[PDB]
Amino acid sequence: AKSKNHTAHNQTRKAHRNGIKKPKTYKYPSLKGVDPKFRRNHKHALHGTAKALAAAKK
Amino acid sequence: YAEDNGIVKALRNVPGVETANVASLNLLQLAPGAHLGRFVIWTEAAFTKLDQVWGSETVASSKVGYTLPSHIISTSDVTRIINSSEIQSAIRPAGQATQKRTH
Amino acid sequence: SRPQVTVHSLTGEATANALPLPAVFSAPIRPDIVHTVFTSVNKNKRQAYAVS
Amino acid sequence: GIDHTSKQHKRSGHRTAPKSDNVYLKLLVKLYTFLARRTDAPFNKVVLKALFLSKINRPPVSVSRIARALKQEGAANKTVVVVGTVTDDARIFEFPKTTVAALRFTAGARAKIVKAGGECITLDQLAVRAPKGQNTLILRGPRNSREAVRHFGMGPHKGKAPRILSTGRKFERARGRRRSKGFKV
Amino acid sequence: PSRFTKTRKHRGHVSAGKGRIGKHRKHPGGRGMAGGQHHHRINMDKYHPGYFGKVGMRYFHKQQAHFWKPVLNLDKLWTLIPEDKRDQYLKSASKETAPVIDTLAAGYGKILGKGRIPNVPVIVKARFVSKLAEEKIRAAGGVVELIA
Amino acid sequence: WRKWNVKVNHNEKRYATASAIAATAVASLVLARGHRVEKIPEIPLVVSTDL
RNA sequence: UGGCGAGAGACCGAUAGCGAACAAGUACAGUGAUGGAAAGAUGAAAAGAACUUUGAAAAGAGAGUGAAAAAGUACGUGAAAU
RNA sequence: UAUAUGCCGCCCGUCUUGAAACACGGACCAAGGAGUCUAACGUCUAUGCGAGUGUUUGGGUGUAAAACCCAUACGCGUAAUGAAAGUGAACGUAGGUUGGGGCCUCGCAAGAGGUGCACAAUCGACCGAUCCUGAUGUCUUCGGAUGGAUUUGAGUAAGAGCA
RNA sequence: CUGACGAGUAGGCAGGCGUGGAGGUCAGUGACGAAGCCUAGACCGUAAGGUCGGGUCGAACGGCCUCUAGUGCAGAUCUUGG
Numbered sequence A: 001a002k003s004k005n006h007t008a009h010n011q012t013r014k015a016h017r018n019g020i021k022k023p024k025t026y027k028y029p030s031l032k033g034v035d036p037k038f039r040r041n042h043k044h045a046l047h048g049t050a051k052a053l054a055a056a057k058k
Numbered sequence B: 001y002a003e004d005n006g007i008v009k010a011l012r013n014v015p016g017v018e019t020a021n022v023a024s025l026n027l028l029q030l031a032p033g034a035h036l037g038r039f040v041i042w043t044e045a046a047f048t049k050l051d052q053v054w055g056s057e058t059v060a061s062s063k064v065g066y067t068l069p070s071h072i073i074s075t076s077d078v079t080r081i082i083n084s085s086e087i088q089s090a091i092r093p094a095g096q097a098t099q100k101r102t103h
Numbered sequence C: 001s002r003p004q005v006t007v008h009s010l011t012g013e014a015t016a017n018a019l020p021l022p023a024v025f026s027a028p029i030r031p032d033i034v035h036t037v038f039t040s041v042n043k044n045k046r047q048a049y050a051v052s
Numbered sequence D: 001g002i003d004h005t006s007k008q009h010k011r012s013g014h015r016t017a018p019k020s021d022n023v024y025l026k027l028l029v030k031l032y033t034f035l036a037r038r039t040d041a042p043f044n045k046v047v048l049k050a051l052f053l054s055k056i057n058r059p060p061v062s063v064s065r066i067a068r069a070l071k072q073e074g075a076a077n078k079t080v081v082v083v084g085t086v087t088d089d090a091r092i093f094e095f096p097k098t099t100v101a102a103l104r105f106t107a108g109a110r111a112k113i114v115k116a117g118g119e120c121i122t123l124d125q126l127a128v129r130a131p132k133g134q135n136t137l138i139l140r141g142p143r144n145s146r147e148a149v150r151h152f153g154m155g156p157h158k159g160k161a162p163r164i165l166s167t168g169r170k171f172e173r174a175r176g177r178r179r180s181k182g183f184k185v
Numbered sequence E: 001p002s003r004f005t006k007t008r009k010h011r012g013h014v015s016a017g018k019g020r021i022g023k024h025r026k027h028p029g030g031r032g033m034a035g036g037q038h039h040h041r042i043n044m045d046k047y048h049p050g051y052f053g054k055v056g057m058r059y060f061h062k063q064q065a066h067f068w069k070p071v072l073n074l075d076k077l078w079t080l081i082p083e084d085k086r087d088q089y090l091k092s093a094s095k096e097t098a099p100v101i102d103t104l105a106a107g108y109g110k111i112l113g114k115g116r117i118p119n120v121p122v123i124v125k126a127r128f129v130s131k132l133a134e135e136k137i138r139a140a141g142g143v144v145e146l147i148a
Numbered sequence F: 001w002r003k004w005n006v007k008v009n010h011n012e013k014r015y016a017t018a019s020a021i022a023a024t025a026v027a028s029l030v031l032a033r034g035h036r037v038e039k040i041p042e043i044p045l046v047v048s049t050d051l
Numbered sequence G: 001u002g003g004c005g006a007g008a009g010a011c012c013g014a015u016a017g018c019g020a021a022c023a024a025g026u027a028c029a030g031u032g033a034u035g036g037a038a039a040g041a042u043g044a045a046a047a048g049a050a051c052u053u054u055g056a057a058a059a060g061a062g063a064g065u066g067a068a069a070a071a072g073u074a075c076g077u078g079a080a081a082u
Numbered sequence H: 001u002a003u004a005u006g007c008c009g010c011c012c013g014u015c016u017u018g019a020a021a022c023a024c025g026g027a028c029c030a031a032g033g034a035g036u037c038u039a040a041c042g043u044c045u046a047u048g049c050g051a052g053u054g055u056u057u058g059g060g061u062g063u064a065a066a067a068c069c070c071a072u073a074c075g076c077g078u079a080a081u082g083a084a085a086g087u088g089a090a091c092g093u094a095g096g097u098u099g100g101g102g103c104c105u106c107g108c109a110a111g112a113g114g115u116g117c118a119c120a121a122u123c124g125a126c127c128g129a130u131c132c133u134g135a136u137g138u139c140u141u142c143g144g145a146u147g148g149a150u151u152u153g154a155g156u157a158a159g160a161g162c163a
Numbered sequence I: 001c002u003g004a005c006g007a008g009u010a011g012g013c014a015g016g017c018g019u020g021g022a023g024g025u026c027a028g029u030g031a032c033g034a035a036g037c038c039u040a041g042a043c044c045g046u047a048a049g050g051u052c053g054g055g056u057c058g059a060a061c062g063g064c065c066u067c068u069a070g071u072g073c074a075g076a077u078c079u080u081g082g
Helices: A036-055 B044-054 B081-082 C029-042 D025-037 D044-051 D062-072 D105-116 D123-128 E082-091 E131-140 F010-023 F027-032
Strands: B039-043 C003-009 D077-080 D098-103 D120-122 D135-136 E070-071 E098-104 E110-112 E123-126 E142-147 F045-047
Touching: A036 F010, B039 B044, B044 F010, B044 F045, B081 D025, B081 D123, C003 D025, D025 D044, D025 F027, D044 D135, D062 D077, D062 D105, D098 D123, D105 D120, D120 D123, E110 E123, E110 E131, E131 E142
Parallel strands: B039 F045, C003 F045, D077 D098, D077 D135, D098 D120, E070 E110, E098 E123, E123 E142
Antiparallel strands: none
């Protein structure tokens, strides 16, 4: 009572029915995984430059 | 009618004629077969009490919480709006209704 | 400026009295809400039928 | 026998007419097809393709969002357009003057806009006033604020709210939600 | 709706939309939530994670009347005043005529802050308040009176 | 225990009755449903209170 | 959802509706507990065919009643298989 | 429409990789005959109202199992988060950047500048939990201010739900 | 008006034909003959099917706008009858 164990025939043809999807990179990719020391610094650097470009500009 | 003085018993025999109070105004009588428009014979007391029942800008409601509905267009005629003055000065001129068959 | 509906007597003879429209006759004439609500309301005097 | 690349006879997936049977909305669609065909201004093609949108795709714009749109710089005199409805918001106290034009208007919204001195305008009166769409603003209510879009794309580590009837303790907080009971999500 | 269902459009097609190979049969997966830790584990993990096990403490004979404590944001707090007196109360933004608001009278057990009541003094009567709500009420001028 | 009677919203019920009363006016929709009003005086037809 | 007395229907219309529209819990089967049918509709009214002839009789053929017996008590219309 | 003639044409349904099959059902005809109704829901539409919504458990009426009118609650929604005690959402035009339909100004036009709702990505702020920091006072060891952190939620960020 | 395209089982969706019954309308048709049945007679629609003529027959039935469903058959060693 054996049967077919595996194939990959009609697997590269199903995928190309819908056209292998490019991963949609963005401007400002997510900082999840960036080193936490640099991440804390860049948090406070953006925090500083928002103060500098909000308070000084009137 | 608005005040019954032997009117339902008077006209309950004649075929077709149905009577209805103002405060009732059944929908199953006014639009039979979901088709609009029944030839309704009002009485004068019924006409004024209809003004009291459904309300207007002056009288308020007499149905708690109810206001007569708002339109979403100001005039049911559209060609009147399309014509009048202001649109046609903003409109590019017209092509022919059926086009020439070139080639 | 309501269009001043006149009142008829019992013997015809349209009387000089006049009445304004009660502003129900300027409501939105909606055939579709009347249609669907008429179907849902007309199903409300049905009795139960069933087999044993 | 043509070798085809994409779908034969592909219905575009957009609407061409509103699925609703409201007669007066079909009259507004009748008017804006004329204006979108013969004014060649883009405003008439954004109103026309927002009348076709459904009830979920026309979420209601609170009158406080109209207050934010009139606190916007250089836009204090624009006549704001909301294809859809306009609902009242009881959280604002100062409301500005100018014109709001929508399909519908809730009762508190007309009360507040007329109380502040403004004028509520149905879209055909705006088409009389602004044929090419002179001096307007189109707002949209939030679409991803729904109770149903709160649950879309439910899966592991995606943080999107399991469809559930009764919440609290004891209902989907065990194995698969915390570390001590197996895994977390 | 019987004339609108698709099993009336299937009159003429052998299997009525259920398939010839995989025949429509009685209960092929089980009755109900069968096999939750079994052949449906991939459906008890994702879309329902956390369905299996215990989490908390048992509260024998729980009465929800004990836990009646609806909240009121400072965003509303003026809809408790009726709309006719509200404009007379926003004007004369001053003491000695502060509008008494009994928040319990509409059924609110706690007053929470959510942003910027106007500068009119207000005597909020409540059972519970939150710390960032009473600071905003006090900064508006009015005070909070604890009732029961 | 088939569902025999159907709920309608109360305000939509009043909406439909309001649209029916508004349709009992000027008689395109009244001449549409038969209703031989081809020779009448003006519509809405109001008769005196004596009736 | 039992008994009696009532009113009704977006139900079924005689292979349906109760098992039962009829002498239906009947005919019938089983030692018994029990099982359990089929079967309505000539015409307005029997006026349901006097009389003659063929045949031993059933019947036929004429005659006649009937709007019509291409309605004759195997009876309304009377399909398909055959 | 019948027949003659030329060429073609294996009985349908079914499982099946494949049946005209030496696979199974089918002698014929008439009638009956198989995804229906309900409870709770999901997604999508349409309608009413919309910070609400829901008349119909019940009451008054009635041309009386219909229609009509209605109080009080109650259900869902308007607030989350914790096992729980409990606490419970604006530093800032409720933010910053990028991309944005449309609108405004200049320009004949192409375009340039401003404004940028929805939506997409991302950095912040705030609310609850967790882990830290833990000051003034102190029914003298209770109490939490401030400051945080690659932690965490089905949160907020001028409400979108109800029927 | 212009252009492109048209295999399809399981399957999905759309536009529709038919049936029993319900609200409306055509002041519809009809014992000077409705419904039904037969009809190598005819017309329309791609098709579901609709329509007419002839015969038979004997009292009810349709078009359209909507509603509702015990709604459509060649097959189930399908049920009953022949």
